[PDB]
Amino acid sequence: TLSILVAHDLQRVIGFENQLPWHLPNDLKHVKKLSTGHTLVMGRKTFESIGKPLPNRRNVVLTSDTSFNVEGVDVIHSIEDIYQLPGHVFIFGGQTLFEEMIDKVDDMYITVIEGKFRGDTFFPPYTFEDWEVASSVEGKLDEKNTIPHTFLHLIRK
Ligand SMILES: NC(=O)c1ccc[n+]([C@@H]2O[C@H](COP(=O)([O-])OP(=O)(O)OC[C@H]3O[C@@H](n4cnc5c(N)ncnc54)[C@H](OP(=O)(O)O)[C@@H]3O)[C@@H](O)[C@H]2O)c1
Numbered sequence: 400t401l402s403i404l405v406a407h408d409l410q411r412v413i414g415f416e417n418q419l420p421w422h423l424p425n426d427l428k429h430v431k432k433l434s435t436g437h438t439l440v441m442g443r444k445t446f447e448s449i450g451k452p453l454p455n456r457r458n459v460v461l462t463s464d465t466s467f468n469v470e471g472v473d474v475i476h477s478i479e480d481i482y483q484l485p486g487h488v489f490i491f492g493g494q495t496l497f498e499e500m501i502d503k504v505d506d507m508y509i510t511v512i513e514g515k516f517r518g519d520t521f522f523p524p525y526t527f528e529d530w531e532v533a534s535s536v537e538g539k540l541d542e543k544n545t546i547p548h549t550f551l552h553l554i555r556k
């Protein structure tokens with residue numbers, strides 16, 4: 400299976416100055432639950448943003464840099480390389496990867512951040528005419544997690 404994994408706000412903002420615009424521990428827990436034991440494919444900027452590979456899963460970085468050879472990270476240099484990766488592969492960002500992959504993926508695991516943030520990078524537009532809502536689950540709020548959010552699993556019709 401090839402899936403997108405993304406958090407975007409009400410206006411599809413995903414990032415600002417190479418980081419997330421929001422602090423939301425529960426979204427990171429969601430990512431952990433979905434992708435542990437599986438594969439993440441990410442662009443070079445996203446990787447440099449996190450700074451090290453995420454534990455307990457295969458981290459794959461897409462870059463044109465032929466000098467890229469980082470411990471605990473597998474590198475790929477083409478979109479076409481993604482299709483040779485076994486198991487459940489999650490397209491992990493950022494904007495460029497999402498734009499390149501949204502027409503190719505089986506499904507999407509979206510965390511809708513129910514706020515309006517300043518962004519400089521965006522998830523591409525999509526329509527529910529093309530995507531069935533397999534599930535929609537409201538995130539629980541508390542002291543550590545104060546921004547309303549909804550976990551959507553969308554499957555291409
Ligand atoms: N909210 C979220 O779900 C989420 C998730 C991840 C990231 N983000 C945010 O997204 C933003 C970053 O997005 P971005 O678009 O600027 O960068 P990005 O997608 O993370 O990385 C862009 C880089 O990926 C590489 N790349 C992409 N397609 C390629 C291809 N076909 N062949 C070779 N290399 C390719 C290139 O690296 P080289 O220049 O080295 O060739 C390119 O410059 C940040 O603000 C970050 O915080 C948000």
Ligand SMILES: CCOc1ccc(C=O)cc1-c1cc2nc(N)nc(N)c2cc1C
Nearest residue numbers: 404405406418419427430445448491492510
């Ligand atoms: C680009 C900055 O994003 C991060 C920085 C730190 C951490 C820490 O776990 C996680 C993220 C992060 C959260 C994310 N959350 C969701 N729902 N989906 C993603 N595709 C995603 C990707 C990254 C990279």
